[PDB]
Amino acid sequence: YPCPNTVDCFVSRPTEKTVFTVFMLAASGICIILNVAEVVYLIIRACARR
Amino acid sequence: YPCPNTVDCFVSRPTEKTVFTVFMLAASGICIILNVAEVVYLIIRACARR
C-alpha cells in the first residue's frame, strides 16, 4: 500500500552491487574460517604448553 | 499488453451512462413486446377476415 495492484520497480546497479556483494561475502567467509582456525591453533598451542 | 501487470482505469460517467442504458433497454424491450403483440393481432385480424 498504496501501490495499486502490482507494479514493476527497477534497481539502480544490480550487477555491480552483485559483484561487490560476492566480494564482501567471500571476505566474510574467509574471516570466519580463519577465526575458527586461529581458535583451534590457540587450543593446540595451549595443549603443547602443558 | 503493454500495460504492466494489472492497472486500474476509471470510466468517465458511470452513473449517467447507466441511467441512459436503462432507459434505452426499457424502450427496446417495450418495442419487442409491442412488435410481438402487433404480429399476434395481425394474425387474429386475418383469421377474423375469413
Side-chain angles (χ1 to χ4, degrees):
Chain A
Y1 186 87
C3 303
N5 316 310
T6 290
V7 300
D8 316 320
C9 307
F10 304 89
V11 191
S12 167
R13 299 164 188 263
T15 310
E16 198 162 29
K17 280 169 187 169
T18 297
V19 167
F20 276 85
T21 298
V22 170
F23 269 102
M24 287 300 246
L25 253 52
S28 211
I30 283 180
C31 267
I32 297 182
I33 296 170
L34 260 49
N35 271 327
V36 167
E38 173 185 23
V39 161
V40 179
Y41 181 91
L42 281 178
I43 287 183
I44 297 181
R45 168 136 285 188
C47 191
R49 209 181 86 111
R50 189 163 201 184
Chain B
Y1 186 87
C3 303
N5 316 310
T6 290
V7 300
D8 316 320
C9 307
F10 304 89
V11 191
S12 167
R13 299 164 188 263
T15 310
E16 198 162 29
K17 280 169 187 169
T18 297
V19 167
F20 276 85
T21 298
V22 170
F23 269 102
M24 287 300 246
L25 253 52
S28 211
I30 283 180
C31 267
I32 297 182
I33 296 170
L34 260 49
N35 271 327
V36 167
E38 173 185 23
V39 161
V40 179
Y41 181 91
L42 281 178
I43 287 183
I44 297 181
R45 168 136 285 188
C47 191
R49 209 181 86 111
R50 189 163 201 184

